[PDB]
Amino acid sequence: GQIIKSIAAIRELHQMCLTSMGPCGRNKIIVNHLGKIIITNDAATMLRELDIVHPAVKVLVMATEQQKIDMGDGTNLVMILAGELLNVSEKLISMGLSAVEIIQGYNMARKFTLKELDEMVVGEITDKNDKNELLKMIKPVISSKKYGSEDILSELVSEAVSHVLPVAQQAGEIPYFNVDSIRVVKIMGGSLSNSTVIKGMVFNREPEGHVKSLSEDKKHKVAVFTCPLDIANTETKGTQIDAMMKEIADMGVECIVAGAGVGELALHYLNRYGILVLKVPSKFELRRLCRVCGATPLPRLGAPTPEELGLVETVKTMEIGGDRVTVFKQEQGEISRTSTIILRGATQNNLDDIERAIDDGVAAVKGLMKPSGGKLLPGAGATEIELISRITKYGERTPGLLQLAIKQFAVAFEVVPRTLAETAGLDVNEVLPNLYAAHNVTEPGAVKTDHLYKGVDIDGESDEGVKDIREENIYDMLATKKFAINVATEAATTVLSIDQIIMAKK
Amino acid sequence: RQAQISNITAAKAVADVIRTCLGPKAMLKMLLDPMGGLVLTNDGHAILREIDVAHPAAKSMLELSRTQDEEVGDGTTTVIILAGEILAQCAPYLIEKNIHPVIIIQALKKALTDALEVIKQVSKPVDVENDAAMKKLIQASIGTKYVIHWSEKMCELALDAVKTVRKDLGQTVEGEPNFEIDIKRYVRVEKIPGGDVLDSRVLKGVLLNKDVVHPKMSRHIENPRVVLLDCLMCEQILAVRPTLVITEKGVSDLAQHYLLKGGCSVLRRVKKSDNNRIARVTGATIVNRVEDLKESDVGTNCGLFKVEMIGDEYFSFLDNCKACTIMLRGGSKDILNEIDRNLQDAMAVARNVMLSPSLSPGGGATEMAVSVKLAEKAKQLEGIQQWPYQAVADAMECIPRTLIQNAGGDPIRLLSQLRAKHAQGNFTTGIDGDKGKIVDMVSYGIWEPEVIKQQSVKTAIESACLLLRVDDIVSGV
Amino acid sequence: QGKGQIISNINACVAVQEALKPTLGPLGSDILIVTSNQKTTISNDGATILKLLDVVHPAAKTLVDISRAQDAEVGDGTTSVTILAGELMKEAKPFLEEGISSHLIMKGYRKAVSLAVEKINELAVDITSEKSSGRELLERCARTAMSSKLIHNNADFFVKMCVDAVLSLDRNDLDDKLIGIKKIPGGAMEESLFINGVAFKKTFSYAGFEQQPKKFNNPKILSLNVELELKHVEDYQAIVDAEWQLIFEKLRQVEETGANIVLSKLPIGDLATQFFADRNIFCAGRVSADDMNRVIQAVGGSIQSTTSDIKPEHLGTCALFEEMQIGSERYNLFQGCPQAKTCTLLLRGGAEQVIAEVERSLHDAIMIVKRALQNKLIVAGGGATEMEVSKCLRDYSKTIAGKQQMIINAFAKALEVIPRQLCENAGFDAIEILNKLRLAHSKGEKWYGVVFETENIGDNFAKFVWEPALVKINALNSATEATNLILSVDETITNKG
Amino acid sequence: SGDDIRNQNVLATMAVANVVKSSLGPVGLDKMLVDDIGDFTVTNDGATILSLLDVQHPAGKILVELAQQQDREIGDGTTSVVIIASELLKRANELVKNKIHPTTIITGFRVALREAIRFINEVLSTSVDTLGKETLINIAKTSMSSKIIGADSDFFSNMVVDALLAVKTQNSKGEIKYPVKAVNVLKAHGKSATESLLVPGYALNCTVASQAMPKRIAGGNVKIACLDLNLQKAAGIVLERVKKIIDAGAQVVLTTKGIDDLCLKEFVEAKIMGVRRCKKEDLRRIARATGATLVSSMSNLEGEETFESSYLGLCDEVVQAKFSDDECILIKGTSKHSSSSIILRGANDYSLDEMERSLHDSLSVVKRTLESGNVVPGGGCVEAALNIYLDNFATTVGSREQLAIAEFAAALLIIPKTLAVNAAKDSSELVAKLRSYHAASQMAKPEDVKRRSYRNYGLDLIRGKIVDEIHAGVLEPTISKVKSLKSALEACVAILRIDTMITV
């Protein structure tokens, strides 16, 4: 049985993710073959580092790539749903239900699940781009990464997000928020309260010039050059240095950036006269300077055409955690298209891992864009437990052997409320049966009131049963759920269809 | 938990052996002895007889089959299959869900109570005082025996047997014993060599194969006075007004003529143990020597005395008006023994219906009906017991599954059709053996004594607790 | 895999604890570390010990990384991080085997560190002039740091230098680079020479004596890098003079600068002293850029590799520059430089390791005074603070019900590993001291702790054994995080090749 | 020798504990015992589990041998010895690695016993607080919840106790113990289960031989003559025996072998109460209740009669009261009888046979609980209250034994710990809460400052809570728990004294 051997393989990565997902989750130590210690809860980082052996794993891993590239969340939702969807299929296999009949069932359930998810909508983010509306989503996204640190990270992100979401109104066809709109840097030392946000670009390299600040005027004009700065060389061969700034400043420039090297006298004179000098090793970061300072790089040398100058409010050199950085930023004007997250933290693993979490929080806001992304679902398995009950109803409505598959299909959605419990340390022999009753009630009405809000208690508030998601404002993104169901349903269908693994001609 | 797992793996194997031993189309099992013997029997008792087991849990599966067979003459493989899957379906609940055995045991007890409710609901009443229907019932219920051509009397012989043994008491003072029957002891069947199966008859009393000493003798005395003696003496006998003289030892001509002169019959070779059986049905006093005969030698409670010869042996009828003796007739003692193999089996069939006047929907309709009724109860039951409660429902589907598998049909699709037939339709929908089709038990009767299903479930859950309650296997002498 | 991955991870961190456990205390033991350069270092400095452990187990790499952060963020307490962090994990062994989950354990450790930091805040006493004079604030503390040592008889010698060594710094700017130590072989302990500023041992590797007056009341220090020494048939000479004249004029370009002291990073020989003797310019090459940058921070000069581009802006002047025969060798000293915030001590003694014992005995005493000026809030030493947190967290476990009660109790038990190792490493009866200390603390005295003079417990405030509050706070917070990092690992995935 | 044999000793005794660990508790799990013959047996009986346990390691022969003495000497306490001792040894090895000399460990454990015996003796309770409050009703309910009458046990258990409350006897020189075979109870079909009646006195299993004879004679003070030899024709002589009943003055006559038609009518004319055919065992208890002495044959140097003032007993009042198909002879009181009676009503005798099953157990268990005078709050109260008190004892010595006082005290939590593990309930939650409920009982309660500061709260294994085991009714003998601890340290010391093993 190839399908039996495949089940054995997925049991390995199922064990990996089963204990991973959740704010109470457990970290994994990952040793890079190049000599790096990686400790994270991100299963995408895990699978990137995990060598793949059994070809059936290649299906599940590439599935998580579809989720992670196309959606900034859902990594464990794919691995967790997929793991159990194939685990419960072992019962269907052993009951004698053929592979094609199991496949037909999961596809029939794909339609049932998607239609119900549309009915599970509780609220909707009205796209006010307000810090309060952002926090409603940013908090639960930061959750599952660092439990209890949401206060520090929420104030960091929601304020940083307001830097890259400018004042926009009547805008549903104008896209905003590129993933590169928020940069995160690492400064060894300090703690969470030592982190901050800069409204613009921060160079991790120490100040290279001798000038600390520009003038006090608003919208200090700035130049970027592409050609190497030296004594004017003729258009051909040749087998003035400082005169560049005499040309640049004509329009109002206090800051001169050189995308290339610097000539003899200018290295002294550009800084001597109080002008900031910059050369950037990252050429995409030069494209960032086009977005932060608004600077249009001059393709020629020593000829700052007026159209090749930008307007940047303030550029200064700043001290972060004792290690010096150079800041090219905007200030209440020519609003910066990039904001920088200043992470001060002493442990290089927690420091880097905090960045890994904030990177995902940035990605979540990309999904908070206009593509039908405001829809909210009830979190803490209220979506999952309610889906269980509604799926079993479709079983009663469905004649044939498809009834057997639908029944085992609902069982699979218990892995998410189970994982929330096993990681949190509440007895799965008590929390799970209390979840069933909390969501399974006889409502005097067609609208379940306060019974779609029943949650899973991951807090230390000792209580028999579970809590209400509105207490902490725990909502899940509908688009994350809907896309995840599509990925996992098709991914499990793929594994369930593998009848033989044949080596190609070699 | 590892020790409890090993107990589970034991019963799964016991069941896999017995699994396909159920049905008129049952597959045969090959018993290989180390001496080279090979037996293809379909008797699940014989299968369990030779199965050499390792885990003592399997030894309790054997003791379970002994318990069922001793009480209810049927239920052998029904209990082994049912009990094993009851344990097996609980396996992921033990290992994966981390459910403590005490929780699982408590859940099975609640399922037992609820299951007995369903068994009552699906029952069909039958009137045990309708002897004509009891003949049609027992004759069909003993189906597939060697005496089909003689089933008329091979059935009626058992009906007239249980007719009298019925332990009849009913009142609110002591209670209703419900016609408790002991076929082993209370019934003393006297198999008569000679005759044919259909010539077999039923008597009332005790019948002895001890022959008569003189061919001319008082043949019938309606109110005799029986002298039970082992050993002047012939005259001493008559002092107490006797009519029948029974001697333990051999008897000479003098005892024939002297007692005949006074109108007394002579019977020889009757041991004091048969003289005690005479006392059970008449009441004569057992005496050794004739000089010790006293006035207590009486022949009370003697309805009929008969001396007829059958099978080269004269018989002494101790007839009187929880005991009976059947005058079974057979061309040989092996034919008489063949009667037992088929007749006493009918006695169990009648014992079951006399135990409770109720029938069970066969063809597996009982089990699939339980699997549906438990499902409706499960979703209405709160607590962790929602998980183990469903285990019994999945276990009750194995019995109808084996009826399909041994019928050669699709074991998956036919079960799902049965589920829908019991869900929206009647509880009487079962499995046909020959056609392999889903049929209603109204058309294809196969109505089974309910007490078989009641004791099968009771003993299955009982043994399931015995297998789950064991936490380790420890060596000790 | 599974819960047993934690068992293995704890066992690894225990191994680290067992190696580091003998190092706690000024009376403690040393570890002999053989590095891959065949550079053998025997040290009780946990910062050096942790640097050179070369731990490979993935879990121990985390533990060591946490402790190396203690050094950069605080600078002291790196040993207490490793001992405290390890015992908090060792005491978790019975909890894991009983089925207590990683969240249940970690949530409790976070509960305890919150309860503890607040009790540390209550224990904090603000010592500026509070019941202490300015001189004895530093003096009595440094005298305590040096008590009962090999330098005990010279305590007045070393404390007189030690207290004013830090006091001679900028009280607004404390930095270890401003107190340097030279390992000067030869001379007795009391022969150690304190330099008001910076001195170096003249690595000038050639002759040239009886020339170049070497002492200056107002020198002009110039720093070079390059070597200005030199090293038809008659025409063969021209190539030698061609180069000689070049560097000889460059030697004049030094004279054109006007330097009295010329420094070099490269060897300077007698051929270079040809001109410097003719113009009488002291020159010392092969000089560390640390002492040269201290010249930059002493007299305010600049280092120019070449001789031509040098202007007066490169020169600086000290109050006294003197080469001395003190130390059975010539040493050059700068004292009273206008910009100098630094001082150095030339340690003389019977041997390099005898100096090392004085060196690290002093290095600690330097840090004792360093943080006397840095930190305003102090906490009790001798483990009294660890007993203070022990009593308070024990009381919280009495008033808290639930799984937290047992977990908090383990936290309190582990707090006594600090006084325990302080007892064992000093040779005391650990059973007796732990019991007498616990009961006496429970009688209300918050200052009782380990007395090293006489095996006993007593008031570490009266003994002026003071530890910084932030040393205790940041270390305790760091240890809690370390236990959260190790106890939270469920699986190790290694990409091999 | 050394730490090697010490480590081997602990592993052996922990393996023994792995056998009895799961058996502790009324809801525990059983062990399967397998011999080489091929037989198997499954039991939770601790004595049987240990008796058939094959121990190869020599250390376990000491631990088992103690428990063998425990059962033969006391009759119970076989499970606690192994579990308590194995925890003491598990924690002792930690003291060994902590540089605690084995002698110091033993010395302190003995000091803890001297302190613990005093604590247990102070915190125990006597055979009191059982009347008018549900201490024996909940104890009886415990035995009766497993019976078919369980639903109605509130009504039946009231009679189990109320009857036993009146049968206090002196036994052997005033033991103050209840008779096991007593309270003659009648299984009857009369009415519904909850209407069963409690009788204020004893009912000899019989009625008045003839319905014509008077049924209540000498209401104030009555003499009873029990005869065996019949009054039947063998007739004026066996009738005259009634004239001897008259002259000898027996007011209630218990004639075992029957009464002639003339004797029955002579009793009527004599206004004497006649009785026929009584149960012999009840007549012997009548000989001890009223004193009526069964005369098997009339000799006494040619005496033939009830033997005036000799073989007659003494009773207060004898009544036959009709209770709707119950007409039997009632015995009020007397100098010493200690007897009673209960009427059972229900569906039928086959259903009242459950009362035979119920009272056989319930009367036996309730009597066993009142067999011991001093009783213990069960449910880890005696283990957990020691945990709290012994913690404070740590301040009395506070030298080297302080470490052993703690480990001894902490080992006493293995019992409330194991009780929870075997019960499926959360072991860490239940044990911690047990400690906190007993913790505060040592603070203000002994200062007589209490709003609700009262101990004797213990582990409820059924409802899953911690409840006042006095109002819940779980009690254990003080002779058992005190002997249990005394036994436990006997083996703990014995194993800790093994520092060398030589194999020859």
UniProtKB/Swiss-Prot annotation, chain A:
The keyword Cytoplasm applies. Gene3D superfamilies: GroEL, GroEL-like equatorial domain, TCP-1-like chaperonin intermediate domain. It is found in: Cytoplasm. Keywords: ATP-binding, Chaperone, Cytoplasm, Isopeptide bond, Nucleotide-binding, Phosphoprotein, Ubl conjugation. GO terms for molecular function: ATP binding; ATP hydrolysis activity; ATP-dependent protein folding chaperone; unfolded protein binding. It comes from the Eukaryota. Disulfide bonds: none annotated. GO terms for biological process: chaperone mediated protein folding independent of cofactor; protein folding. InterPro entries: Chap_CCT_theta (IPR012721), Chaperone_TCP-1 (IPR017998), Chaperonin_TCP-1_CS (IPR002194), Cpn60/GroEL/TCP-1 (IPR002423), GroEL-like_apical_dom_sf (IPR027409), GROEL-like_equatorial_sf (IPR027413), TCP-1-like_intermed_sf (IPR027410). GO terms for cellular component: chaperonin-containing T-complex; cytoplasm. Molecular chaperone; assists the folding of proteins upon ATP hydrolysis. Known to play a role, in vitro, in the folding of actin and tubulin. In yeast may play a role in mitotic spindle formation. Heterooligomeric complex of about 850 to 900 kDa that forms two stacked rings, 12 to 16 nm in diameter. Belongs to the TCP-1 chaperonin family. This is T-complex protein 1 subunit theta.
From Swiss-Prot, chain B:
GO terms for molecular function: ATP binding; ATP hydrolysis activity; ATP-dependent protein folding chaperone; unfolded protein binding. It is found in: Cytoplasm. Its main location: cytoplasm. It comes from the Eukaryota. Pfam families: Cpn60_TCP1. The keyword Ligase does not apply. Coiled coil: none annotated. One of its GO terms (cellular component) is chaperonin-containing T-complex. Disulfide bonds join C321-C324. Molecular chaperone; assists the folding of proteins upon ATP hydrolysis. Known to play a role, in vitro, in the folding of actin and tubulin. In yeast may play a role in mitotic spindle formation. NCBIfam families: chap_CCT_gamma, thermosome_alpha, thermosome_beta. Belongs to the TCP-1 chaperonin family. Heterooligomeric complex of about 850 to 900 kDa that forms two stacked rings, 12 to 16 nm in diameter. This is T-complex protein 1 subunit gamma. It comes from Saccharomyces cerevisiae (strain ATCC 204508 / S288c).
Swiss-Prot record, chain C:
PROSITE patterns: TCP1_2 (PS00751), TCP1_3 (PS00995). It holds the Pfam family Cpn60_TCP1. Keywords: ATP-binding, Chaperone, Cytoplasm, Nucleotide-binding. Molecular chaperone; assists the folding of proteins upon ATP hydrolysis. Known to play a role, in vitro, in the folding of actin and tubulin. In yeast may play a role in mitotic spindle formation. It is found in: Cytoplasm. It comes from Saccharomyces cerevisiae (strain ATCC 204508 / S288c) (Baker's yeast). Its main location: cytoplasm. Belongs to the TCP-1 chaperonin family. GO terms for molecular function: ATP binding; ATP hydrolysis activity; ATP-dependent protein folding chaperone; unfolded protein binding. This is T-complex protein 1 subunit eta. InterPro entries: Chap_CCT_eta, Chaperone_TCP-1, Chaperonin_TCP-1_CS, Cpn60/GroEL/TCP-1, GroEL-like_apical_dom_sf, GROEL-like_equatorial_sf, TCP-1-like_intermed_sf, TCP-1_chaperonin.
Swiss-Prot record, chain D:
Changing G28E: Temperature-sensitive. It is found in: Cytoplasm. Pfam families: Cpn60_TCP1 (PF00118). PANTHER family: CHAPERONIN. Heterooligomeric complex of about 850 to 900 kDa that forms two stacked rings, 12 to 16 nm in diameter. The keyword Cytoplasm applies. The gene is TCP1. GO terms for biological process: chaperone mediated protein folding independent of cofactor; protein folding. Keywords: Acetylation, ATP-binding, Chaperone, Cytoplasm, Nucleotide-binding. GO terms for molecular function: ATP binding; ATP hydrolysis activity; ATP-dependent protein folding chaperone; unfolded protein binding. The keyword Chaperone applies. This is T-complex protein 1 subunit alpha.
